[PDB]
Swiss-Prot record, chain A:
Chain's gene name: rpoB
Catalysed reactions, semicolon-separated: RNA(n) + a ribonucleoside 5'-triphosphate = RNA(n+1) + diphosphate
Family per record: Belongs to the RNA polymerase beta chain family.
Protein name, UniProt field: DNA-directed RNA polymerase subunit beta
Keyword Transcription: yes
Source species: Escherichia coli O139:H28 (strain E24377A / ETEC)
Family matches, as Pfam families: RNA_pol_Rpb2_1, RNA_pol_Rpb2_2, RNA_pol_Rpb2_3, RNA_pol_Rpb2_45, RNA_pol_Rpb2_6, RNA_pol_Rpb2_7
Complex and partners: The RNAP catalytic core consists of 2 alpha, 1 beta, 1 beta' and 1 omega subunit. When a sigma factor is associated with the core the holoenzyme is formed, which can initiate transcription.
Gene Ontology CC: DNA-directed RNA polymerase complex
Class of the enzyme per the UniProt entry, highest EC level: transferase
Annotated positions of the N6-acetyllysine modification: K1021, K1199
From Swiss-Prot, chain B:
Subunit structure of this chain's protein: Interacts transiently with the RNA polymerase catalytic core formed by RpoA, RpoB, RpoC and RpoZ (2 alpha, 1 beta, 1 beta' and 1 omega subunit) to form the RNA polymerase holoenzyme that can initiate transcription. Identified in a complex containing RpoD, the RNA polymerase subunits RpoA, RpoB and RpoZ, CRP and DNA. Interacts with Rsd; this prevents interaction with the RNA polymerase catalytic core and with promoter DNA, and as a consequence, promotes transcription from promoters that require alternative sigma factors.
Protein family membership: Belongs to the sigma-70 factor family. RpoD/SigA subfamily.
Section covered of the full-length record: 457 to 535 of 613
Region: Sigma-70 factor domain-3, residue numbers: 2-78
Notes on the domains: Contains 4 domains, connected by flexible linkers. In the active conformation, the domains are in an extended conformation, each making extensive interactions with the RNA polymerase catalytic core. In the autoinhibited state, sigma-70 factor domain-1 packs closely together with sigma-70 factor domains-2 and -4, contrary to the extended conformation that is seen when the protein is part of the RNA polymerase holoenzyme.
This protein's name: RNA polymerase sigma factor RpoD
Protein species of origin: Escherichia coli (strain K12)
Function: Sigma factors are initiation factors that promote the attachment of RNA polymerase to specific initiation sites and are then released. This sigma factor is the primary sigma factor during exponential growth. Preferentially transcribes genes associated with fast growth, such as ribosomal operons, other protein-synthesis related genes, rRNA- and tRNA-encoding genes and prfB.
Subcellular location per the Swiss-Prot or TrEMBL entry: Cytoplasm
Source superkingdom: Bacteria
Curated annotation (Swiss-Prot), chain C:
Origin organism lineage: Bacteria, Pseudomonadati, Pseudomonadota, Gammaproteobacteria, Enterobacterales
Protein name as it appears in the record: DNA-directed RNA polymerase subunit beta'
Family affiliation: Belongs to the RNA polymerase beta' chain family.
Top-level lineage group: Bacteria
Quaternary data: The RNAP catalytic core consists of 2 alpha, 1 beta, 1 beta' and 1 omega subunit. When a sigma factor is associated with the core the holoenzyme is formed, which can initiate transcription.
Span within the parent record: 755 to 804 of 1407
Role description: DNA-dependent RNA polymerase catalyzes the transcription of DNA into RNA using the four ribonucleoside triphosphates as substrates.
Species assigned in the record: Escherichia coli O139:H28 (strain E24377A / ETEC)
Length: 1341, 79, 50
RNA sequence: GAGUC
């Protein structure tokens, strides 16, 4: 029960559990976010829509003219994908927006009856996303990475110890907006509440509320709980609630109702408290002492004179009590500060707070922000309000609001951007809470506390910035000029829009060169997630906490995919099935468990939601699609793990692989590999290079099919049907009549991309997979990318590896390889490098492109064309000239000697310099294609014309045959409708084609569809004639490059780079190595059978590195080839189809608890023999990550391969013929050659270009530079007594010009004498000291 | 200076009217002078660039670490 | 952590157990980046005295 | 961006 591609290559799944729901299209994140940016949805406030409504409608100063926004339109892209690649253009669509100018009258009230002007203006070109999910940035493929940051809202942070000898507890709530300055509230050492405003410094929280016009009285009212203190006669009575005595030492005889309650001294315990609570107490009998020490709530004015006896927040005292009762204010209202629950926090605060009213509050605000600027009323107010309450300046976004409201335990999900005043108060409440112990602290690193930015929200923000600057300009020009005759189009500027865009896309560090080493690198790299960037974490700002592994990463980020070194912990890969919710929180899918029974229902939960419920692992065993195996089962909840019974089971994992990222999912026996090496493994895969030959990975996870498919470097079938034409360049497919649209013809076209240059110098080669006239369905793999076999990821190739020591050639993970690898051309890398030539003009005169060069042989002349151009297909090496260039020289002032000599040989030589572009040495290969970019101004070269003529021919042929094949399919489709109600085959066909439009038959629904494809035919004409005329002009149009530049030549070089000693290779398990020697076939040990090995790894590389998976791969790998060899023999032996039938089926179904229940027998003989030959080259088996094949099932296969159960065989040493005293481990393993080429990494310098200021050699192989000798290295020489080597390094090898030059020629004169000088860096140094104004001079002896 | 003023202010006009970048020919016509002087002024327009501009995406190179000095001949040359 | 790893590499650990190990793994590797800086600077101090 | 310890 499987499709045609799968029928062709079925891999045997060992996976003991069924993945329920499908592996979601991985690169969906990018598209979905970006698509949101443009989403035409009126209500949905996002992207365009969001930004527009935030600013608009834009009203003028005078209140009579206004600018209104209607709606937007995206044009069809000015420049196509491929074309932009060619010319170095950014791929983009026009944005045009409908805007209306309305003018009210001044005099008539607001009579919009005067003037209404409207139009669609051009607002620039907006970079478009590809079908792949990539972006076209000045002719190179870039990807925008997802960005994690701390989400807007509230962070409740505690400093456990953190700071102090004392070791005091410091609580801080952090206010993080989308857009605006930041707010920090923290506890002083003596428990007093301070604010950091825009983390500037620390001042009293209370002052803010003063600015918000709260008197000290209102402050303490809202915060602290008032207590009614009645004074009658000479007795003082409080209105006491029982649970305020909570653990209160009795200071008096506490007479309530009847008899003595509380001991004079004995503490109130809970029983006492509950007893008096029961009594229902209103007023007790306190003595003289209790009120002295507390504080008064309101501002109690003296009725008698009118003057204040007590202000708010004064310490309570003896005489004041007498005077207030004398005023006849017999309802005083004391405060409650008995530590514990409600402590003296705000009270102490207010005393240290020097500020008084609204007025002095805003003074201090203003002062701290700009110390020394005089207090103008307007400035202070405006500052305060603009800081937190300005809408365009301060925006929390939906995000900030949601998380904020969930921090304080509110109810509304959405809100307005600006901070409502009640919010502020309530949080300070929660701070005071935590200080007492009502609630506890939220963690920085919680996945609910971190939010991710996709594409659209990034876009959103940067678009808003262009808008801001444009707003200054817009509102400015709206008031000066005349209102009537001037129109909207003259108003509007484009510059700053396009500026903002190019800054985001071009300048951003989150926007980078796609990793195109392999499909894996690309696909993985696109879903990588960075903690850095704007609004995000720095290197020094990062301690252990954030970089280390947070439990919430489970099923969301793969824990084991991050670069080694300093960026570790910062950048991580999204796990497989994980996706982002609306809010930009990561969600993971789970299966519902209804009362013990495991349903089919899938629920995505955020981190926050995850914290609540109780979920079983994927590995727990499933009872017959109902309940569980075990009565006590294994699960996790609220961030911890252990045992629970069936009934308590709420949810469950869909599959094991949901914890793992994509790259890691591909490594097979991950279960047996230590994470140290596991991590390394994933990274290695990313650095692997496609060879030419794709050999299907024999030991896969099944995941290789999905990886291929999603990378999108292959061709997939849109419709399915039958293949009409197959070319190694074009695949044309005729659709199933079922699926076919009655709109256009049923003809789907796939032009394949062949042999272009990737960013890393890699080759990009598509191979068609199916054959001609073959059947395919929707979503069939039609053509493969480079590192892909029939459906599957083919990172590389599989070879016979043997674990054992060789004569120290495999020492410390060094690799012994056979000559057979070269012989079979496996791991031969394809490289495509771009070389360039650049012709400008100076004051020195026009540089130009010619074949004429001073003092060169006809050797170079012969390989050049008319204009000085390489011929197509030329084989070229280091030192060879590719493109000729000449540059005007200045005056030739020669030494007298050279003057005479010129005269003597008599070759004057014109005032010109050889500027020609040459092949760099060491590299050499094949010039495959050449492109030229002429200037618009200067006239074209003959080379120029002939190549642009080629473009014409090619354009023509391509589009001509496009039309021709489309036409034939459409006419053939009309033939299917005329053949229904009108049998005529002899005189229709033999008669002309287009005289089938004079066709006037039955007038029912037969005649209508003819016109359907007839009008479509007229559009085939008008579209084509346009699509031609457009692409003719662009070819012929003068190509616009940088100022000063006449002409450019791009030269695409092919490098056939063979694997060699010093090249880098590895397997999936982290284990790697350099090739140390190529041994001839003879030297490698071999079987009794006679087959010798391919590669030899040293065993000692495994144990201490802790990666056993490679071993299991080896064993399973030989077994797979055992199957392949069984098949190979029975294939070569023909025999009977049914016999083959038997063997093969029993092979699949062998695995003890095999899930993948392979249906064979029904298979038609054709399908059978075909598949046979595929698995001829080894069977493809599937161990899923964790859900993998046990040792048992593996040994079982070894028996079926007729091999040793340990996978060891007695081998003969190919040198001696002596047998190895122990049987050794062999088998087939999947290997890869890394991007690291000794070819490029080779470098050495004698003498070359030097640095300008310091006069030392420049850096790197790039400049032909000298290597840097660092402090440590110097120190080496120091330890030995070695003065002369040191001094060499110091002088003749570096900054002494006289010294180095003199010593060079003395060396050439067989002297080898040193003769030291003086470091030029030293003189440099001296003069800089003088320039900074300090006198330093060299003392004579 | 004033000729430069003309340049950039008419740049905006022409970019929007024509659709894209202003090629020298059309610009030449619209500003009332000969093509020669257009290209001249174009290249003269550019200001000096920072010597210590961090071209190293990582503060590996201040562009001074690119600079080669043609003045000083090689020891090879001296030979 | 209270719950340990009962199985071994050869038999293969499970989902749950493997995740545990990343903590130690990552912690160790992260240690390399930032700790060798401390050692290095130390070394340079010592060298500059002696 | 990746290699080395």
């Amino acid at each position: 029960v499987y499709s045609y591609t799968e029928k062709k290559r079925i891999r045997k799944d060992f996976g003991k559990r069924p993945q329920v729901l499908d592996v979601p299209y991985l690169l969906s994140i990018q598209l979905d976010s970006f698509q949101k940016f443009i989403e035409q949805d009126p209500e949905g406030q996002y992207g365009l829509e969001a930004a527009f409504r935030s600013v608009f409608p834009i009203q003028s100063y005078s209140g009579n003219s206004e600018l209104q926004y209607v709606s937007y339109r995206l044009g069809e892209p000015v420049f196509d994908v491929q074309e932009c690649q060619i010319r170095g253009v950014t791929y983009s669509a026009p944005l045009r927006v409908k805007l209306r100018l309305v003018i009210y009258e001044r005099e008539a009230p607001e009579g919009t009856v005067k003037d209404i002007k409207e139009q669609e203006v051009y607002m620039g070109e907006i970079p478009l996303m590809t079908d792949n999910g990539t972006f076209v940035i000045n002719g190179t493929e870039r990807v925008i990475v997802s960005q994690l940051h701390r989400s807007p809202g509230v962070f409740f942070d505690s400093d456990k110890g953190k700071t102090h000898s004392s070791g005091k507890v410091l609580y801080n709530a952090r206010i993080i907006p989308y857009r605006g300055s930041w707010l920090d509230f923290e506890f002083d050492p003596k428990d007093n509440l301070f604010v950091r405003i825009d983390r500037r410094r620390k001042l009293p929280a209370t002052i803010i509320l003063r600015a918000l016009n709260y008197t000290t009285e209102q402050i303490l009212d809202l915060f602290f709980e008032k207590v009614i203190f009645e004074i009658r006669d000479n007795k003082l009575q409080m209105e006491l609630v029982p649970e305020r005595l909570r653990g209160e030492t009795a200071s008096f005889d506490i007479e309530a109702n009847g008899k003595v309650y509380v001991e004079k001294g004995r503490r109130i315990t809970a029983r006492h408290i509950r007893q008096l609570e029961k009594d229902d107490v209103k007023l007790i009998e306190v003595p003289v002492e209790y009120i002295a020490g507390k504080v008064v709530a309101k501002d109690y004015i003296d009725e008698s004179t009118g003057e204040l006896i007590c202000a708010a927040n004064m310490e309570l005292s003896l005489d004041l009590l007498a005077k207030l009762s004398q005023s006849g204010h017999k309802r005083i209202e004391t405060l409650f500060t008995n530590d514990l629950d409600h402590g003296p926090y705000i009270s102490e605060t207010l005393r240290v707070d020097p500020t008084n009213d609204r007025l002095s509050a805003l003074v201090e605000i203003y002062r701290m922000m700009r110390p020394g600027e005089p207090p103008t009323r307007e400035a202070a107010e405006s500052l305060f309000e603009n800081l937190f309450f300005s809408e365009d300046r301060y925006d929390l976004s939906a995000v900030g609001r949601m998380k904020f409201n969930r921090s304080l335990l509110r109810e509304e999900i959405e809100g307005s951007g600006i901070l409502s005043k009640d919010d502020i108060i309530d949080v300070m409440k929660k701070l005071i809470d935590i200080r007492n112990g009502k609630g506890e602290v939220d963690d920085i690193d919680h996945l609910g506390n971190r939010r991710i930015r996709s594409v659209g929200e990034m876009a959103e923000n940067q678009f808003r910035v262009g808008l801001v600057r444009v707003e200054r300009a817009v509102k400015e020009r709206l008031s000066l000029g005349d209102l009537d005759t001037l129109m909207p189009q003259d108003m509007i500027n484009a510059k700053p829009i396009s500026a903002a865009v190019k800054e985001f896309f071009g300048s951003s560090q989150l926007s980078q060169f796609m990793d195109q080493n392999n499909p894996l690198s690309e696909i993985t790299h696109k879903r990588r997630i960075s903690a850095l960037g704007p609004g995000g974490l720095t290197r020094e700002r990062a301690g252990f906490e954030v970089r280390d592994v947070h439990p919430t990463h489970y099923g969301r980020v793969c824990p084991i995919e991050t670069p080694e070194g300093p960026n570790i912990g910062l950048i991580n890969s999204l796990s497989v099935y994980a996706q982002t919710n609306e809010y930009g929180f990561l969600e993971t899918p789970y299966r519902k468990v209804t009362d013990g029974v495991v349903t089919d229902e899938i629920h995505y939960l955020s981190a926050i939601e995850e914290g609540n419920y109780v979920i079983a692992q994927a590995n727990s065993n499933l009872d017959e699609e109902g309940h569980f195996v075990e009565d006590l089962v294994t699960c996790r909840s609220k961030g911890e793990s252990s045992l629970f019974s069936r009934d308590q089971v709420d949810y469950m994992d869909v599959s094991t692989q949901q914890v793992v990222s994509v790259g890691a999912s591909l490594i097979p026996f991950l279960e047996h590999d230590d994470a140290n090496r596991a991590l390394m493994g994933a990274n290695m895969q990313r650095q692997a290079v496609p060879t030419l030959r794709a050999d299907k990975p024999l030991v896969g996870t099944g995941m290789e099919r999905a990886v291929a498919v999603d990378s999108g470097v292959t061709a997939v079938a849109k419709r399915g049907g039958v293949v009409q034409y197959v070319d190694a360049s074009r695949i044309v497919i005729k659709v199933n009549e079922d699926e076919m649209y009655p709109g256009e013809a049923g003809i789907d076209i796939y032009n394949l991309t062949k042999y272009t240059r990737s960013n890393q110098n890699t080759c990009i080669n598509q191979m068609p997979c199916v054959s001609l006239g073959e059947p395919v369905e929707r979503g069939d793999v039609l053509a493969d990318g480079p590192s892909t076999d029939l459906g599957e990821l083919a990172l590389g190739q599989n070879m016979r590896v043997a674990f054992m020591p060789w004569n120290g050639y495999n020492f410390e993970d060094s690799i012994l390889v056979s000559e057979r690898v070269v012989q079979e051309d496996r791991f031969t890398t394809i490289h495509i490098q771009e070389l360039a030539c650049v012709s400008r003009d100076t004051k020195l005169g026009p540089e130009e492109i010619t074949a004429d060069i001073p003092n060169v042989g006809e050797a170079a002349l012969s390989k050049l064309d008319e204009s000085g151009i390489v011929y197509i297909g030329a084989e070229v090496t280091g030192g060879d000239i590719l493109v000729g260039k000449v540059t005007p020289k200045g005056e030739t002032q020669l030494t007298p000697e050279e003057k005479l000599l010129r005269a003597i040989f008599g070759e004057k030589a014109s005032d010109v310099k050889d500027s020609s572009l040459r092949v760099p040495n060491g590299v050499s290969g094949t010039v495959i294609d050449v492109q030229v970019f002429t200037r618009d101004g200067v006239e074209k070269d003959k080379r120029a014309l002939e190549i642009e003529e080629m473009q014409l021919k090619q354009a023509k042929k391509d589009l001509s045959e496009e039309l021709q094949i489309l036409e034939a399919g459409l006419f053939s489709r009309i033939r299917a409708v005329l053949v229904a109600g009108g049998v005529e085959a002899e005189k229709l066909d033999k008669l002309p084609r287009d005289r089938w439009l004079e066709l006037g038959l039955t007038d029912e629904e037969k005649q209508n569809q003819l016109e359907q494809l007839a009008e479509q035919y007229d559009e085939l004409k008008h579209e084509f004639e346009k699509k031609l005329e457009a692409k003719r002009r662009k070819i012929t149009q003068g190509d616009d490059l940088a100022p000063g530049v006449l002409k450019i030549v791009k030269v695409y070089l092919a490098v056939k780079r063979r694997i060699q000693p010093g090249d880098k290779m590895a397997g999936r398990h982290g284990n790697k190595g350099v090739i140390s020697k190529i041994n001839p076939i003879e030297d490698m040990p071999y079987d009794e059978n006679g087959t010798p090995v391919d590669i030899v790894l040293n065993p000692l590389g495994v144990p201490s590195r802790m990666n056993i998976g490679q071993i299991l791969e080896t064993h399973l790998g030989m077994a797979a080839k055992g199957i392949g060899d069984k098949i190979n023999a029975m294939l070569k032996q023909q025999q009977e189809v049914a016999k083959l039938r038997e063997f093969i089926q029993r092979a699949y179904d062998l695995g003890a608890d095999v899930r993948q229940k392979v249906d064979l027998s029904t298979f038609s003989d054709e399908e059978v023999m075909r598949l046979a030959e595929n698995l001829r080259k080894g069977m493809p088996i599937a161990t899923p990550v964790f859900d993998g094949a046990k040792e048992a099932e593996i040994k079982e296969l070894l028996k079926l391969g007729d091999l040793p159960t340990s996978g060891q065989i007695r081998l003969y040493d190919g040198r001696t013929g002596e047998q190895f005293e122990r049987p050794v481990t062999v088998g087939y393993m999947y290997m890869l050659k890394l991007n690291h080429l000794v070819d490029d990494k080779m470098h050495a310098r004698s003498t070359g270009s030097y640095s300008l200021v310091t006069q030392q050699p420049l850096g790197g192989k790039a400049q032909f530079g000298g290597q840097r000798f660092g402090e440590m290295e110097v120190w080496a020489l120091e330890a030995y007594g070695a003065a002369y080597t040191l001094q060499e390094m110091l002088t003749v090898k570096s900054d002494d010009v006289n010294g180095r030059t003199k010593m060079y020629k003395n060396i050439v004169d067989g002297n080898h004498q040193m003769e030291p000088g003086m470091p030029e860096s030293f003189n440099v140094l001296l003069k800089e000291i003088r320039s900074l104004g300090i006198n330093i001079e060299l003392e004579d002896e | 200076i004033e000729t430069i003023n003309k340049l950039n202010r008419i740049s905006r006009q022409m970019l929007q009217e024509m659709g894209r970048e202003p090629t020298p020919e059309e610009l030449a016509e619209r500003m009332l002078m000969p093509e020669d002087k257009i290209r001249k002024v174009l290249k003269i327009a550019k200001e000096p660039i920072s010597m210590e501009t961090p071209i190293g995406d990582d503060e590996d190179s201040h562009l001074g670490d690119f600079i080669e000095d043609t003045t000083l001949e090689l020891p090879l040359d001296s030979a | 952590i209270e719950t340990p790893i009962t199985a071994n590499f050869r038999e293969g650990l499970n989902v749950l157990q493997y995740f545990i190990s990343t903590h130690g793994a990552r912690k160790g590797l992260a240690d390399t980046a930032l700790k060798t800086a401390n050692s290095g600077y130390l070394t340079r101090r010592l060298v500059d005295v002696a």
